[PDB]
């Protein structure tokens, strides 16, 4: 059988997804919990040119704020007591495919920045030093909070907003 | 504060993307051009860059008017 | 001689214990203080397949909330001023046997989570880093408070409830 | 909101466990099937998974009805 | 010359002291201010087997409630801004001898507990960590308040009562 | 609620201590045994443990009756 | 020219001052406002052996009750948000000389105590910790209220009374 | 309640201080000794300690009587 | 054109203002509502040496009695929940110029004092701590109530009266 | 209660200020000196300090009499 | 069909409403209970330029006098035991539209003032602190009592009267 | 007490508002000017400010007389 | 076409730039964000004698305070784990040309000093050791904060102020 | 505290720079010389060194007065 989309506003949103097909600009999805955000990311990617490519979805809340900037990107050896190898990255694992960051508002100012730098340059370095890796990952942010607000609270970098705010989809409860 | 820039810039962009995503989009309609000039553009040049890449992709025919734009602006 | 069970509701509860015998799903016991909760855990385990195996009962109230997440699981060296060796665990001591957590409601949100993760995965890590130990311990929670309530108070993780709520026994005063 | 799922799922589960704990339990009775459909299932699929592992263990004969279920649901 | 005991009830209490001689179970003394409590402790100890051993009397009121749990027992280095050495203890100074805690009711719930643990185990640790010292001190509590009452007020641990309530002497005004 | 325990327990204790403090105390008298059974024993087994270590020390002869006990119970 | 004393009771009080000369025991001066208390302190000290030594007079009312126990004695660093250096003391400034505490009744129970301790031991510590300073200051209390009364009101420590009540001068209106 | 102590103690003190402040004070007169015994001494030993350091300093001759004492007691 | 003064008593008061010119001692103006008090302050200052300097007039009634001692002077950070910066002051804004406190009687005893201290010393501190600012402000108090009276009511500090009562002008209805 | 102070003090002050505000004021007249001595001076030395700074400023010629003073005292 | 206006005095009042159309100055409506006041407000607003904009009518009597100054404006967090978020406002909800305060006389002196301040400045702060919000709301007061009277009773601020008394409509019974 | 102000002020106001609400109102008629001068103006300048914003809005032609004013004053 | 300067104060500032032409003394530019500071630096340099020479503008905020003293100047090999070659410098890259340090206040005390040393001597060493390089770079500092203030806060070296304060331009918002 | 230095020093500097930047600047005018002497010179000799290199460059004619200086001092 199939999936489920039939209400006007969604009859719509599906198409918006379909059009966005041939694209790679990041996408910002927003709706209350349960509305289908992460279901749209997944669909956007099933529809993007890189459907067959991996889907690296990671809940930004499912990781202590102090280790996100260690697992998203990666880690350069001996910089934090105990390192079995410079740590790879979800960015690197998502290289060539999609990287669905769920619950964006929960990004530390430090990573909010560090992401921005990788959304524009596409290059990143694991900790102190310089970039030595090439990643081609389409950003897909989804959050249930109101981004704009957070911007006047200073909890959310504005320039990072507009950067992910290329394509913006809003799922109605 | 450069409404004399919105329509030219926008037109720049609409060209970039129309060519970037191989879309038969030639340009904005009057009705649309108005809107673009009224929007406050907080993001300024940046926001317009996005608003239009987005409008180029969402585009269905050869032109863009209140239709796709209102979706955003 | 013997032990004591003769009232209908208990004439019952004993059997429920007997049936549960061949199982390992966690069990949630609840009754006012003194009703026999910890007496049932002990009996459940005397009856489980692992009776001969250890019984690691630990009162969650008999340890300052800040050191529970250091003794239940274990501790990775030099993470807290002074560490004679990465600290073992009641989980590790209870490996292969039962782990009767008394007075569950008294679990910090941080450990309530950390337990859940070990009830599903069965793997755990001592502090920051990753899991490197294998523990097979049957969870047996007993509390005298009303769990559900605590869930609307936000003091008790719901998903951790249903996870321990596989088998639920309620001892009447 | 998928009462058309409760009875099939439940039946899935009753199978899993009946095989997991080597119990000669074949399935639910009408009387039981009703209850399962009326329960609100706040936990949803999860809660039903538990409610039935539990009912499979508590099971005495070949079937399950109001008996074991009411104990919970 | 001598000391003073001649009234029946005291003609008595002296003997009770004399009998208790060969013992070490804690003792709970109670009487209005001035009745001779601290005079009895002192006599109990002059009579115990450890008379020649030290007498570490300490008024529980003569120390701010927040520093009692730092001086009775002891203190493990760097746990409170400024520590010249892990702090010894009146318990340790009273090791081998008597420890007359005057005005018991004035014990914080935290220490009331911490004492209990040392009345049973006899081992204690200075702050967070574990016991590494051996103390043999006979507890001698004296208070002018009515313990029992305090128990229904929750200001006084019951189990700590019965523990010190091994031998109980009551000095009549 | 185990008056059938007081007299045996008590007797346990009286033995422990009589041996612990080298006291020629053999046991309780009837008069005493009664009291011990009537006391409510809020502390229960614990309180009796103390009440008797205390009574063993206070003991003067070979037995214990209303005498030493009343001092407490 | 000179100063003014000619009435019998004062013709007297002057002498009492003169005799007290060779002393250092604290002195308690009491009379209605304006009677000449602070004029006597000053004279007592002009006559004591330490006349050439400093005179540290401080109105106990001229300082908010919450900062007296911070300026009389002194202050150990970082114990109250913002400390440029452990604070010296009027006690330390008055070391070797007189310390005329005016309007004693206005002493907080906490300092009334803290003073007593320094009238007997002569050693003091700035906040929590221990004494590390040596002060030789002659106490000179003057108050216009009736001390005794205050003692039955519990607003004034009795033992601190008798301690300052070594030498007591009463100026008649 | 130890009037048998006032006169000996007092005499202790009068000695301490007479030596502490180099005062040729030998002791109290009858008239004085009486007073000291009648005073209630709320402060007790302490108050007498003070009352006499004070009386030793106030002392003019070799003895102390109603004179200096009344000033206080 | 000009302003308005022609009645004898005012033909006068103008001059008194003119003479006072070369001065800086505070001035106390008193008259019924509307009589021209605040018109005289303004004129006194137009005539003082510091006419070109600012005029910081502030109605003492136009601010809740609990926030006057926070805005007149200033405020030292984190002393009251929420502080964006240690608060400046009308005293500091009036530094170098005039500070016309209207309706003086409406000063809390706490500030009545705090002002006095700044009328004599000229130095002030924002909350607890010490003075770290230099203000040269000429005080100009105006009130419509009868000061003296208020002094027997205890609602108005006397010494603060005489301090502002250097130059006193009374505007007749 | 020191009328022997008013005229000397006053004269002190009149000097301070006469020099502080560069006023050619030499001193008080008899008529004035009287008043100053009769005033009760509740403020005492303080009030006189003010009364005269004020009188020095209000001063027009070389002297001060009932004139400026009455304004206050 | 339509609404109802046909008597001369009302045939009138309708027009007055119509003229007032192009305005925003507050309006003061007064008539006995039931006369149609709240029907006129509603009509004034249906006719003002902001008809399509919201109509925030709130009975000043339908809220305990102690919580009006908490709901009209808004509330700054933790200032009153229990605050889930700094409270929004009917002023804020009425921003851009009309705010019909019914039964004005029932305004506490404290709010009567607080309103005035917002009728002139248009800025307001939720409790202690400062304004941080921008509200454009047209005031529409209606009361059945005689305002003027209340002014001589001191129950109603006069300056607040004239401020709302820009346009005044009186509905005859 | 400044009747010489009412007519000028009023005229100020009538100008402000006539321009604020785009009303072709030039000024007051004699009949009107009289009234304005007789009214007691308790509110004073303030009340006149309102009375006229109100009269400017209520205005129908180019002038204002007893008509609109009486409505208030 | 051209650039934009037409207001008096700027009609001015342009000239000041023009005059400064034939110079090399550092220049201190200050104005609120966006005022045109970095636009003036750029113009100063387009006008200096070294216009054709490079322009090395570097935001002092666009680099973690711990790596600025590693990239501005340069780095001597093996002094920090991992060094591919002794690191060159923006100073060295700016040799012969301008070095526009934006947001000066954001300079660590350590570099504030290290810059001073290079503004006077013109010689610098990469880490520990001695100078072995010759750099001729004209300093151009621009900050939006008030330097002077920072000097009383101790966050900004004074002598470094006057050194850059040779020529000072202030852009009005 | 060496106002006798400001004018000589300044004059030193004005010479250094006038020669360093090839500017036909001979010296300060009275009006200017005054200012230089009144300025507090917190930086002292250093600040004057800068203030004048700066004034030499800003210089337009042969002299310097309130003009260029006020820009700074
Ligand atoms: N439009 C839809 N059609 C069918 N199923 C949906 C739809 N939207 C959501 N779901 C279902 O609801 C669940 C919630 O999904 P999800 O989108 O991940 O939540 P959230 O929007 O908070 O990220 C999913 O498991 C999915 O199967
Ligand atoms: N059903 C029972 N039969 C015999 N003894 C029991 C029974 N229930 C409880 N007890 C006794 O009561 C005591 C209280 O036991 P426990 O179950 O541990 O308390 P709680 O239920 O609060 O954990 C035990 O020491 C045990 O011997
Ligand atoms: N549609 C389903 N059919 C059969 N079993 C299911 C179904 N959905 C969930 N389950 C079972 O119920 C449990 C709930 O799983 P999960 O997918 O994690 O729920 P959630 O929607 O909260 O992510 C699982 O362990 C799984 O085995
Ligand atoms: N039975 C007694 N015989 C002789 N002196 C006693 C007796 N009881 C108390 N005292 C005296 O009374 C004083 C009060 O003593 P203390 O027992 O310490 O008070 P409290 O009972 O409140 O602790 C002691 O200094 C002691 O010398
Ligand atoms: N049934 C018993 N028979 C003999 N002694 C006992 C018995 N129960 C308890 N005791 C004694 O009484 C004390 C009470 O012990 P405990 O078991 O800790 O009580 P609780 O029920 O509160 O846990 C113990 O020190 C023990 O020596
Ligand atoms: N006996 C005296 N002889 C001369 N002057 C005195 C005498 N007593 C008080 N004074 C004067 O009276 C004033 C009040 O002094 P003071 O003793 O300080 O007040 P108080 O007794 O309330 O502390 C002093 O300034 C002092 O000069
Ligand atoms: N019995 C005594 N004989 C001689 N001097 C005494 C005696 N008792 C007390 N003193 C003196 O009186 C003072 C009172 O001392 P203290 O023992 O502390 O009293 P308290 O009973 O309140 O503890 C002491 O400083 C001491 O020198
Ligand atoms: N002497 C005067 N000449 C001209 N106008 C005056 C005079 N006195 C008062 N006014 C006017 O009267 C008003 C009331 O002024 P104000 O002095 O501020 O009141 P108050 O005396 O209560 O402070 C002012 O607006 C002012 O223009
Ligand atoms: N005896 C005096 N001779 C000259 N000036 C005095 C005299 N007494 C006080 N003054 C002046 O009067 C003011 C009153 O000062 P102060 O000593 O503080 O009074 P008080 O007695 O209330 O402490 C002082 O500023 C001082 O300059
Ligand atoms: N002029 C009118 N024409 C038609 N209905 C009216 C008119 N005036 C009042 N009403 C009706 O009378 C009721 C009373 O309305 P309301 O104006 O709100 O009372 P009040 O004047 O006391 O605020 C309303 O429900 C409304 O429908
Ligand atoms: N003299 C005037 N000329 C023109 N307009 C005035 C005049 N006085 C007051 N107004 C107007 O009347 C209103 C009354 O203002 P305000 O000065 O605040 O009165 P008040 O005397 O009560 O302080 C102001 O909003 C102002 O625009
Ligand atoms: N005077 C000006 N004329 C023309 N454009 C200007 C002028 N000032 C600033 N700008 C423009 O404004 C922007 C802000 O520039 P910038 O000077 O770098 O900011 P800031 O002063 O904070 O460093 C630049 O992109 C520039 O094109």
Tab-separated table of C-alpha atoms in Angstrom, chain F residues 9-60:
chain	number	residue	atom	x	y	z
F	9	UNK	CA	13.757	-13.883	72.567
F	10	UNK	CA	14.142	-12.180	75.953
F	11	UNK	CA	15.600	-15.466	77.137
F	12	UNK	CA	17.936	-15.458	74.172
F	13	UNK	CA	19.201	-11.964	75.120
F	14	UNK	CA	19.395	-12.591	78.837
F	15	UNK	CA	21.804	-15.363	77.807
F	16	UNK	CA	23.926	-13.311	75.403
F	17	UNK	CA	24.597	-10.523	77.914
F	18	UNK	CA	24.742	-12.699	81.063
F	19	UNK	CA	27.687	-14.188	79.245
F	20	UNK	CA	28.894	-10.884	77.782
F	21	UNK	CA	29.222	-9.128	81.141
F	22	UNK	CA	29.991	-12.268	83.152
F	23	UNK	CA	26.871	-11.980	85.281
F	24	UNK	CA	25.451	-14.954	87.196
F	25	UNK	CA	21.987	-14.223	85.755
F	26	UNK	CA	20.005	-17.385	84.866
F	27	UNK	CA	16.639	-15.968	83.880
F	28	UNK	CA	13.433	-14.103	84.515
F	29	UNK	CA	10.924	-14.787	87.272
F	30	UNK	CA	7.200	-15.310	86.582
F	31	UNK	CA	6.298	-11.830	87.831
F	32	UNK	CA	8.878	-10.507	85.385
F	33	UNK	CA	7.937	-12.744	82.500
F	34	UNK	CA	4.416	-11.362	82.770
F	35	UNK	CA	5.488	-7.738	82.466
F	36	UNK	CA	7.657	-8.487	79.433
F	37	UNK	CA	4.607	-10.002	77.755
F	38	UNK	CA	2.343	-7.036	78.589
F	39	UNK	CA	4.727	-4.264	77.508
F	40	UNK	CA	3.748	-3.024	74.025
F	41	UNK	CA	7.335	-3.173	72.704
F	42	UNK	CA	7.143	-0.297	70.257
F	43	UNK	CA	10.792	-0.781	69.511
F	44	UNK	CA	9.934	-4.464	69.281
F	45	UNK	CA	12.829	-6.930	69.180
F	46	UNK	CA	15.285	-4.050	69.298
F	47	UNK	CA	13.863	-2.415	72.409
F	48	UNK	CA	13.772	-5.798	74.179
F	49	UNK	CA	17.402	-6.329	73.238
F	50	UNK	CA	18.262	-3.096	75.032
F	51	UNK	CA	15.791	-3.420	77.883
F	52	UNK	CA	17.581	-6.675	78.772
F	53	UNK	CA	21.218	-5.883	78.188
F	54	UNK	CA	20.288	-3.103	80.663
F	55	UNK	CA	18.456	-5.454	82.949
F	56	UNK	CA	21.374	-7.934	82.818
F	57	UNK	CA	23.788	-5.234	83.967
F	58	UNK	CA	21.380	-3.886	86.611
F	59	UNK	CA	20.856	-7.485	87.779
F	60	UNK	CA	22.070	-8.257	91.309
